[PDB]
Amino acid sequence: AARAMFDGEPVNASERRPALHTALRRPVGDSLLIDGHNIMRDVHAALAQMTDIVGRIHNKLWRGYSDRAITDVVNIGIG
Amino acid sequence: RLYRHFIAVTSNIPAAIEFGIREKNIFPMWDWVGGRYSLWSAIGLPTALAIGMANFKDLLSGAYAMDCHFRREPFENNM
Amino acid sequence: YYQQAFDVTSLPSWRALQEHRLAMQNFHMREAFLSDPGRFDEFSTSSCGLFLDYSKNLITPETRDLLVNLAREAGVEQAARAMFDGEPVNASERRPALHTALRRPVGDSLLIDGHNIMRDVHAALAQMTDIVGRIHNKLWRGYSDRAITDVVNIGIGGSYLGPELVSEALLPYTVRCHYLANIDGSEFHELTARLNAETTLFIISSKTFGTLETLKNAQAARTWYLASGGSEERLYRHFIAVTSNIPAAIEFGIREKNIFPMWDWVGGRYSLWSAIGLPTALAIGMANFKDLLSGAYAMDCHFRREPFENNMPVLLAMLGVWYGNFWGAQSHAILPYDHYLRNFVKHLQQMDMESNGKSVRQDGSPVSCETGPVIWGGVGCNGQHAYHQLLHQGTLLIPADFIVPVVSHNPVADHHQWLYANCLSQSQALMLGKSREEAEAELRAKGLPEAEVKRLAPHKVIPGNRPSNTLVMETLNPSRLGALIALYEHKVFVQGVIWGINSFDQWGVELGKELGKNVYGRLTSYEAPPAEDSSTQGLIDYFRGRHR
Amino acid sequence: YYQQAFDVTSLPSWRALQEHRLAMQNFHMREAFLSDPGRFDEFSTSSCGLFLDYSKNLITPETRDLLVNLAREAGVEQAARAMFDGEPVNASERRPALHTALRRPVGDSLLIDGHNIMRDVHAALAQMTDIVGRIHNKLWRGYSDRAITDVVNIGIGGSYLGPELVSEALLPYTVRCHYLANIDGSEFHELTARLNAETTLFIISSKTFGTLETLKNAQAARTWYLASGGSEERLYRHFIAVTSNIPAAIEFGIREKNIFPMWDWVGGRYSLWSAIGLPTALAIGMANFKDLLSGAYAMDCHFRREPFENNMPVLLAMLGVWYGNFWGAQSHAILPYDHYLRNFVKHLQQMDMESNGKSVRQDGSPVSCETGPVIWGGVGCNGQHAYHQLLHQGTLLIPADFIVPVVSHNPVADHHQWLYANCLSQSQALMLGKSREEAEAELRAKGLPEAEVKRLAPHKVIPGNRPSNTLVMETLNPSRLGALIALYEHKVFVQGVIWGINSFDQWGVELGKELGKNVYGRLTSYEAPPAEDSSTQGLIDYFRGRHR
């Protein structure tokens, strides 16, 4: 079962989906093919986007409508 | 000028677009990643904004090491 | 010398030097000093503000005669004439080496292909004067129309080491100058953590405007400026360039009037006298920059006019050839006893090692001797507690070049007297040493028992007979610093002439570049072929198994 | 090994290594890599967060077998047991070398003369924690009752290099720490130009509290504090000391509770783990300092437990012995490809050169081999444009140690990918080289005529076959930096054991001190007797003819 979940098999039988939270932690040298598509490319593209935004905000390079640096990030989300 | 104060982590790019969020500030959400298993993906974007991308990658590396331990160890030493 | 290459080991002077080395096998400098009270007078020389003491060397008057004979037989005088006159001494690249031209005054004319390059030199100098006067008088303003006070030089190699050395050494004559060389993003982050985009002016120093690390750092700086509030149409007030690629700097967004020229005949490691030293002039002023140029010019005149027995560059180069080719010394320590001169060793490393680190002659034939040692060292009075122990009691022959001034710019009680005493004592301990008898006598005077004396004596014995040179100045001003740098440049040139090599090409840096592109493509791409070797492939896999 | 000294060159393993060197004369690493796809796997090892690739070396499996045999025959395992257990391995000074004890946890007990020195270690650690927590929480105040934010370490040698290295390398984990080592008054002036006497706290780091330069700088700092408004009775809040001379620090005006202990069994160059690293703990915190100690302790455990074929310190030391004693390499380059690790080479220079720069064995007999090379190098991607040309195309054999992390603390676009690629490509170009055929083929592909091709080909040829080691980490954190420092400490120890020398005494620094007192007395006094040599006398006269 662990092999199936790590390999991308649709272990979420009710929703007919894979459970690939482990894929989010794999390094750039790992490749996982889901329906013939390498989802690790999506994982690391999202990671690079995350790095870009984090570096922008941390270096005070992100500014609001008054063109002042932002120092309060508020996550609106549940669960 | 709303785009500098609202980014989104979502699978609904059009909805975030009509909210007034730029496409380059919309982070992808995937079906194979469950909500309660998604702190490793762009959902953990605030966390990376607090600890930095190096520490976020360190967290990912620790989770990956645990994945390797789970996959490789015999069940008598599998934590 | 750059057209017809001979074997220097076949010269009669070389064979005479081999025989003299066999004879001098048993030579000890201590005995030469007790048997010759005039040794210092015989083996010291002066040139402008520089004083070279080379008496603490494994030489006799016969040794200096033979070394001067070898310098003459190799054609050092004619080679220096050719280099100073604009002949293509860079045979491999078919270029002249005219770093000396950068220090010539306005009355000097040098024709290269029927064109007076001194006009270019002094036009660049006048442009430098204009920009330095604009910035110093707070007449240069950014995109917020505020005066600039942070000049950041984005450049590597010769665009970084020489200018930074002169900026640090000439601090008592000083707008804050910073340097950004490493492609390591941590250096860029640390630098820009102290910079305001409205206030910082960037000098992009790249010859072809295509150097990987320099272009990456310049692109990062432009992105930082744009994302810090600066506007694209107004970028010109924060980015000037020293380059031979005017169009590239043009599409970067740099005005043509802020583009300083780089010439082929000026090597990168020999270019602190040209517009590459623009940050230095921005820190010390144009008068002090011209004083540095005048000191370098005075050293050039001393090199060209003096007989080889009193020619400081020729004497230093011949001592280096002596120790590296007849005593098997593979390294040369540079010990400047001045806190401002602590970065002298880095520039000396580039200048000497990138130039004389060759294994083919000017025509391409393999060399017949050792050409180019390792340059190392560090600031004085700090290396005594760090690595002078190996100099005193190690098993290696490491010639040392001590550099110290007589006058300190910031005297603190008797600290400079102690610094001078420490430099002199290090040289004297290198030459003298401590024998078994002296160590035993000191232990007995300390009252230790006979068994303890005989146990401790061998460990305290310093062999001595370690050669050293001392360079003394009255003060480290721009003029004497320029003379010092030019003296080491000419020493490197003379050594390269003796070894028959090209001191002005760097062909050993291209393979690393090609392999860097290959390794980067392997690191980033997903389905890449295996690397050429399993070690590079394993390191690529180690990167890929950990990078996110 | 510190009591009975033998001749290492007489060991059968040494003679086997000589025969193997004769056999390996014609060995080329490129051929070994095309003829063995598993070479990287065979010649790489890991330990905690450190990965050592030593496949790009002039070795075969037989070479590693013979080097491990020599390490066993010299008694490296028993010597390491003796050093770790508290035996007086410093035979000349009759002291133990217990820098490893400084990294042991509270559950470890080590009895020296019936006393548990680990109690002292952890009492000092708790004192360090108390002071660091006081200063970090702004609970430490000066004579104006204002919080201190500038900690200045007045110390030289081991009190300066190691702490400053760890402070700079662990910057992403950081009160500002400054260092004042040079007796040069210009350094003191530059330092105090940024300091407020109401705010600066000085740590006087001197073992005997009698070191010339350290005492002079401390006296200058005390005078500066008194003349800047501070009061004598309240001086205690600006001067703490790390010293073995409690009374001297007492009459300086330092409280006994602010005097940190220095022990004889801790050498100066091995003391960044003790209270000497107090400034470092003041910059990174006590948790990160303990993480550094834990990494060093993990490296100690790896050194003590691993077989010599997978023992990273033993492998590095044996490769160094191999190249320095059988291939005639007199220097070793250290190339850290990390901007924060740029000062690694200075501490490595002190650690290696002051320890292994010896020419007598533990019993005092002369050594029978070369013991201790020159350590040099510099920050990565900066030396490629400075001195890697000599590495690629020079005539010297210089083994190189590349150090690079996989993850950057401050990523800037793809700059760290390029840094990693540059490190890997430098190693690969060192191993491979470019032959005449490859250069000619590239020139032909560029379209150059045949005459131009044959003129330019010999100059572009890189010989290759230059050995190198690569040390990789995931990230440069306190733990892995501590492991790296401890690995190099153990490598130095193993090399000193192989050479039969004392790696923990420094007897080559006393003669310079005595001669410094003599030269200072001659410089200052009016009617002084002439110096022992005419060169020192002439330099004294040059000083006297210009000093006012």
Side-chain angles (χ1 to χ4, degrees):
Chain A
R3 294 196 236 111
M5 177 200 63
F6 270 80
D7 277 7
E9 300 199 6
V11 291
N12 189 354
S14 93
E15 288 175 356
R16 284 185 181 297
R17 316 211 274 221
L20 289 166
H21 42 282
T22 48
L24 307 170
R25 333 149 183 173
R26 290 167 169 250
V28 82
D30 277 349
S31 91
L32 213 161
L33 255 46
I34 295 298
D35 298 343
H37 173 75
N38 192 233
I39 62 144
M40 285 319 294
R41 304 169 139 277
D42 300 345
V43 163
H44 291 293
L47 271 174
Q49 193 183 350
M50 255 183 94
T51 315
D52 182 62
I53 316 275
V54 169
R56 285 210 257 155
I57 293 171
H58 277 205
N59 293 320
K60 320 214 190 42
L61 291 213
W62 192 291
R63 289 166 299 152
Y65 76 97
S66 78
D67 290 37
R68 188 147 75 261
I70 61 158
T71 166
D72 281 319
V73 162
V74 171
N75 184 39
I76 301 155
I78 74 193
Chain B
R1 180 89 47 110
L2 179 134
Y3 71 96
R4 335 196 166 180
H5 294 281
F6 290 81
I7 72 188
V9 193
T10 168
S11 289
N12 204 358
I13 309 159
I17 279 156
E18 55 244 21
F19 198 93
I21 300 156
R22 299 287 208 231
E23 276 113 359
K24 94 180 172 161
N25 287 350
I26 295 163
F27 292 79
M29 278 202 177
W30 305 291
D31 292 23
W32 27 277
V33 178
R36 52 193 180 271
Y37 297 102
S38 46
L39 68 103
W40 325 102
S41 70
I43 291 203
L45 179 56
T47 304
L49 278 166
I51 66 179
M53 275 315 291
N55 285 325
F56 192 76
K57 288 154 180 165
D58 204 40
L59 177 92
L60 286 171
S61 300
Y64 182 69
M66 197 36 96
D67 301 341
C68 293
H69 163 92
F70 175 48
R71 286 301 311 281
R72 86 169 138 260
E73 279 281 331
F75 284 176
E76 318 90 40
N77 313 273
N78 213 320
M79 278 178 49
Chain C
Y1 85 106
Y2 59 92
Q3 300 163 323
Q4 295 189 331
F6 60 97
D7 167 35
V8 69
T9 69
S10 76
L11 295 183
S13 39
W14 191 277
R15 314 189 230 108
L17 275 169
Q18 315 203 39
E19 302 148 10
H20 188 56
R21 163 64 177 92
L22 291 172
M24 288 266 302
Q25 167 73 59
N26 262 336
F27 174 86
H28 203 289
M29 277 171 326
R30 198 206 264 260
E31 290 158 12
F33 267 103
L34 297 107
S35 88
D36 192 17
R39 173 162 246 267
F40 170 80
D41 280 323
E42 156 81 352
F43 290 120
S44 51
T45 177
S46 330
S47 99
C48 317
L50 294 201
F51 183 77
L52 171 61
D53 179 30
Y54 61 103
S55 31
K56 295 169 180 135
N57 275 296
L58 307 182
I59 58 177
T60 53
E62 181 184 348
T63 319
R64 189 184 57 196
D65 293 6
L66 290 163
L67 289 168
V68 164
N69 283 343
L70 174 70
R72 254 154 215 162
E73 285 215 43
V76 169
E77 214 140 23
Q78 303 96 252
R81 294 196 236 111
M83 188 204 34
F84 272 80
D85 277 6
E87 299 199 6
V89 292
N90 189 354
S92 93
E93 288 175 356
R94 294 192 173 285
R95 315 212 273 221
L98 288 165
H99 43 283
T100 48
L102 307 170
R103 333 148 182 174
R104 290 168 167 251
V106 82
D108 277 349
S109 91
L110 209 157
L111 260 67
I112 295 297
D113 298 343
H115 172 80
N116 197 36
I117 61 144
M118 297 291 335
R119 300 168 144 278
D120 301 345
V121 164
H122 291 293
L125 272 174
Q127 193 183 351
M128 264 180 75
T129 315
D130 186 60
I131 308 274
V132 169
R134 285 210 257 155
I135 293 171
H136 277 205
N137 293 320
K138 323 214 181 43
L139 298 206
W140 193 290
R141 289 166 299 152
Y143 76 97
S144 78
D145 290 37
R146 188 147 75 261
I148 62 158
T149 173
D150 282 319
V151 166
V152 171
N153 183 38
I154 301 154
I156 75 193
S159 315
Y160 161 56
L161 286 164
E164 188 231 358
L165 152 75
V166 188
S167 287
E168 247 314 302
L170 296 184
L171 216 66
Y173 302 86
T174 49
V175 172
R176 293 172 298 281
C177 53
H178 313 284
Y179 292 85
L180 176 67
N182 208 342
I183 203 165
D184 203 346
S186 95
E187 202 210 12
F188 175 72
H189 162 87
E190 293 298 317
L191 158 75
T192 51
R194 320 182 228 133
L195 301 182
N196 188 355
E198 293 167 30
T199 285
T200 304
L201 162 83
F202 297 103
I203 315 181
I204 305 169
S205 296
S206 182
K207 174 62 162 59
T208 62
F209 219 84
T211 311
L212 180 95
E213 300 88 352
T214 307
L215 283 210
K216 293 285 182 177
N217 273 317
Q219 279 320 335
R222 137 193 272 271
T223 305
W224 175 78
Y225 157 74
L226 286 174
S228 197
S231 58
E232 225 189 332
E233 101 283 346
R234 170 97 38 121
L235 179 135
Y236 70 97
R237 338 203 176 170
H238 295 282
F239 287 89
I240 77 197
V242 194
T243 168
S244 290
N245 203 357
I246 308 160
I250 279 157
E251 46 256 11
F252 197 92
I254 300 157
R255 298 289 200 231
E256 280 119 335
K257 95 180 173 161
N258 289 350
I259 295 164
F260 293 79
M262 281 210 201
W263 305 291
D264 291 16
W265 30 275
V266 178
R269 52 192 180 270
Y270 296 102
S271 48
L272 68 103
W273 325 101
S274 70
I276 290 200
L278 179 57
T280 303
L282 277 166
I284 66 179
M286 274 315 291
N288 285 325
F289 192 76
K290 288 155 180 164
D291 205 49
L292 177 93
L293 287 172
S294 299
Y297 182 69
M299 192 32 96
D300 301 340
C301 291
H302 164 92
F303 176 47
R304 286 300 312 282
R305 87 170 139 259
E306 279 281 330
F308 284 177
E309 318 90 40
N310 314 274
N311 211 322
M312 271 168 65
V314 164
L315 290 169
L316 283 197
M318 281 345 275
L319 283 169
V321 163
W322 177 236
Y323 290 130
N325 286 136
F326 302 91
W327 297 82
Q330 297 177 350
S331 69
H332 180 67
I334 308 282
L335 320 171
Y337 272 68
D338 186 9
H339 161 81
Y340 295 132
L341 258 201
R342 62 199 185 279
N343 288 328
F344 194 57
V345 193
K346 289 152 146 73
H347 173 57
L348 270 206
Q349 279 188 333
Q350 196 213 5
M351 195 217 286
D352 199 308
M353 292 177 90
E354 201 172 8
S355 323
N356 289 342
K358 314 283 158 78
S359 44
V360 293
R361 296 195 260 254
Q362 284 264 41
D363 63 332
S365 34
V367 301
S368 36
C369 53
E370 315 95 317
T371 88
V374 164
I375 303 311
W376 68 280
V379 72
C381 166
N382 278 9
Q384 313 176 197
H385 339 290
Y387 47 74
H388 281 208
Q389 154 83 38
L390 196 130
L391 299 180
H392 292 303
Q393 284 188 312
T395 63
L396 295 183
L397 176 84
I398 317 159
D401 273 7
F402 291 86
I403 306 176
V404 73
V406 174
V407 185
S408 173
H409 281 103
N410 329 96
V412 175
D414 56 343
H415 283 202
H416 188 86
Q417 279 99 282
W418 272 117
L419 185 70
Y420 198 91
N422 282 349
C423 181
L424 258 57
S425 74
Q426 284 310 289
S427 312
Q428 185 185 36
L430 283 180
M431 176 246 306
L432 289 181
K434 188 196 297 203
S435 72
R436 185 80 169 253
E437 292 73 57
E438 310 174 45
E440 274 165 356
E442 295 203 50
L443 293 171
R444 282 158 188 144
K446 288 170 205 179
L448 295 189
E450 187 66 29
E452 186 78 22
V453 157
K454 309 294 298 233
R455 175 191 80 83
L456 223 34
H459 299 282
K460 313 234 176 163
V461 163
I462 288 103
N465 211 40
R466 319 294 200 153
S468 61
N469 291 323
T470 321
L471 276 163
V472 197
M473 21 195 80
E474 175 136 34
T475 326
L476 180 68
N477 56 13
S479 186
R480 282 172 197 126
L481 178 64
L484 191 68
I485 302 162
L487 155 81
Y488 272 108
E489 285 172 333
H490 294 323
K491 171 213 171 155
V492 167
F493 167 77
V494 175
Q495 263 164 357
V497 163
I498 295 279
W499 297 324
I501 58 162
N502 189 354
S503 297
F504 313 104
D505 63 341
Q506 50 290 303
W507 291 121
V509 301
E510 311 303 312
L511 178 62
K513 287 172 205 225
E514 318 147 16
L515 299 192
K517 323 262 208 43
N518 296 346
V519 169
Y520 179 86
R522 222 94 58 196
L523 287 188
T524 58
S525 75
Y526 263 100
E527 276 290 337
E532 333 176 26
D533 51 293
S534 68
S535 177
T536 310
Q537 184 53 45
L539 292 173
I540 284 162
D541 288 347
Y542 192 92
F543 180 89
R544 280 172 75 69
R546 279 149 202 80
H547 170 256
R548 298 166 160 81
Chain D
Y1 85 106
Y2 59 92
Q3 301 163 323
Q4 295 189 331
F6 61 97
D7 167 35
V8 68
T9 69
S10 77
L11 295 183
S13 39
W14 191 277
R15 313 189 230 108
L17 275 168
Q18 315 203 39
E19 302 148 9
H20 187 56
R21 163 64 177 92
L22 291 172
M24 288 266 302
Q25 167 73 59
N26 262 336
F27 174 86
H28 203 289
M29 277 172 326
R30 198 206 264 260
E31 290 158 12
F33 267 103
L34 297 107
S35 88
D36 192 17
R39 173 162 247 266
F40 170 80
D41 280 323
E42 156 81 352
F43 290 120
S44 51
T45 177
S46 330
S47 99
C48 317
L50 294 201
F51 183 77
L52 171 61
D53 179 30
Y54 62 103
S55 31
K56 295 169 180 135
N57 276 296
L58 307 182
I59 58 177
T60 53
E62 181 184 348
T63 319
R64 189 184 58 196
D65 293 6
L66 290 163
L67 289 167
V68 164
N69 282 343
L70 174 70
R72 254 154 214 162
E73 285 215 43
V76 169
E77 214 139 23
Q78 303 96 252
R81 294 196 236 111
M83 188 204 34
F84 272 80
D85 277 6
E87 299 199 6
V89 292
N90 189 354
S92 93
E93 288 175 355
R94 294 192 173 285
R95 315 212 273 221
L98 288 165
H99 43 283
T100 48
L102 307 170
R103 339 151 175 168
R104 290 167 167 251
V106 82
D108 277 349
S109 91
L110 209 157
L111 260 67
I112 295 298
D113 298 343
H115 172 79
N116 197 36
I117 61 143
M118 297 291 335
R119 299 168 145 278
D120 301 345
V121 164
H122 291 293
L125 272 174
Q127 193 183 351
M128 263 180 75
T129 315
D130 186 60
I131 308 274
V132 169
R134 285 210 257 155
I135 293 172
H136 277 205
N137 293 320
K138 323 214 181 43
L139 298 206
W140 193 290
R141 289 166 299 152
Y143 75 97
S144 78
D145 290 37
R146 188 147 75 261
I148 62 158
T149 173
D150 282 318
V151 166
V152 171
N153 183 38
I154 301 154
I156 75 193
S159 315
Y160 161 56
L161 286 164
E164 188 231 358
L165 152 75
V166 188
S167 287
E168 247 314 302
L170 296 184
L171 214 68
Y173 302 86
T174 49
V175 172
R176 293 172 298 281
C177 53
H178 313 284
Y179 292 85
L180 176 67
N182 208 342
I183 203 165
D184 203 346
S186 95
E187 202 210 12
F188 176 73
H189 162 87
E190 293 298 317
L191 158 75
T192 51
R194 320 182 228 133
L195 300 182
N196 188 355
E198 293 167 30
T199 284
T200 302
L201 162 83
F202 297 103
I203 316 180
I204 305 169
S205 296
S206 183
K207 173 64 161 59
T208 301
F209 218 85
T211 311
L212 180 94
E213 300 88 352
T214 307
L215 283 210
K216 293 285 181 177
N217 273 316
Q219 278 320 335
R222 137 177 275 256
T223 306
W224 175 78
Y225 157 74
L226 286 174
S228 197
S231 58
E232 225 192 330
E233 101 283 345
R234 170 97 38 121
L235 178 135
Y236 69 97
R237 337 204 176 169
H238 295 282
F239 287 88
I240 77 196
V242 194
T243 168
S244 289
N245 204 357
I246 309 160
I250 278 157
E251 46 255 14
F252 197 92
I254 300 157
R255 298 289 200 231
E256 280 119 335
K257 95 180 173 161
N258 289 350
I259 295 164
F260 293 79
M262 281 210 201
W263 305 291
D264 291 16
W265 30 275
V266 178
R269 52 192 180 270
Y270 296 102
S271 48
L272 69 103
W273 325 101
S274 70
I276 290 201
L278 178 57
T280 303
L282 277 166
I284 66 179
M286 274 315 291
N288 285 325
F289 192 76
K290 288 155 180 164
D291 205 49
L292 177 93
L293 287 172
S294 300
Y297 182 69
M299 192 32 96
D300 301 340
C301 291
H302 165 92
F303 176 47
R304 286 300 311 282
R305 87 169 138 259
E306 279 281 331
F308 284 177
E309 318 90 40
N310 314 274
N311 211 321
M312 271 168 65
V314 164
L315 290 169
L316 283 197
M318 281 345 275
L319 283 168
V321 163
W322 177 236
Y323 290 130
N325 286 137
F326 302 91
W327 297 82
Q330 297 177 351
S331 69
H332 180 68
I334 308 282
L335 320 171
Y337 272 68
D338 186 9
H339 161 81
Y340 295 132
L341 258 201
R342 62 199 185 279
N343 288 328
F344 194 57
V345 193
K346 289 152 146 73
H347 173 57
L348 270 206
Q349 279 188 333
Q350 195 213 5
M351 199 217 285
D352 199 307
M353 292 177 90
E354 201 172 8
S355 323
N356 289 342
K358 314 283 158 78
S359 44
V360 293
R361 296 195 260 254
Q362 284 265 40
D363 63 332
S365 34
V367 301
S368 36
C369 53
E370 315 95 317
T371 88
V374 164
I375 303 311
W376 68 280
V379 72
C381 166
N382 278 9
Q384 314 176 196
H385 339 290
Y387 47 74
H388 281 208
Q389 154 83 38
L390 196 130
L391 299 180
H392 293 303
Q393 284 189 312
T395 63
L396 296 183
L397 176 84
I398 317 159
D401 273 7
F402 290 86
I403 306 176
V404 73
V406 174
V407 185
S408 173
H409 281 103
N410 329 96
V412 175
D414 56 343
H415 283 202
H416 188 86
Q417 279 99 282
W418 272 117
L419 185 70
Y420 198 91
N422 282 350
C423 181
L424 258 57
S425 74
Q426 284 310 289
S427 312
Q428 185 185 36
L430 283 180
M431 176 246 306
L432 289 181
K434 187 196 298 203
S435 71
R436 185 80 169 253
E437 291 74 57
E438 310 174 45
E440 274 165 356
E442 295 203 50
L443 293 172
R444 282 158 188 144
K446 288 170 205 179
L448 295 189
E450 187 66 29
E452 186 78 22
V453 157
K454 309 294 298 233
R455 175 191 80 83
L456 224 35
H459 299 282
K460 313 234 176 163
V461 163
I462 288 103
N465 211 40
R466 319 294 200 153
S468 61
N469 291 323
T470 321
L471 276 163
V472 202
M473 21 195 80
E474 175 136 33
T475 326
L476 180 69
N477 56 13
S479 186
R480 282 172 197 126
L481 178 64
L484 191 69
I485 302 162
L487 155 81
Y488 272 108
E489 285 171 332
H490 294 323
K491 171 213 171 155
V492 167
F493 167 77
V494 175
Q495 263 164 356
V497 163
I498 295 279
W499 297 324
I501 58 162
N502 189 354
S503 297
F504 313 104
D505 63 341
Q506 51 290 303
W507 291 121
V509 301
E510 312 303 312
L511 178 62
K513 287 172 205 225
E514 318 147 14
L515 299 192
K517 323 278 217 43
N518 296 346
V519 169
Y520 180 85
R522 268 169 254 296
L523 285 189
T524 60
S525 75
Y526 263 100
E527 276 290 337
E532 334 175 25
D533 51 293
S534 68
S535 177
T536 310
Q537 184 52 45
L539 292 173
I540 284 162
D541 288 347
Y542 193 92
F543 180 89
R544 280 172 75 69
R546 279 149 202 80
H547 170 255
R548 299 166 159 81

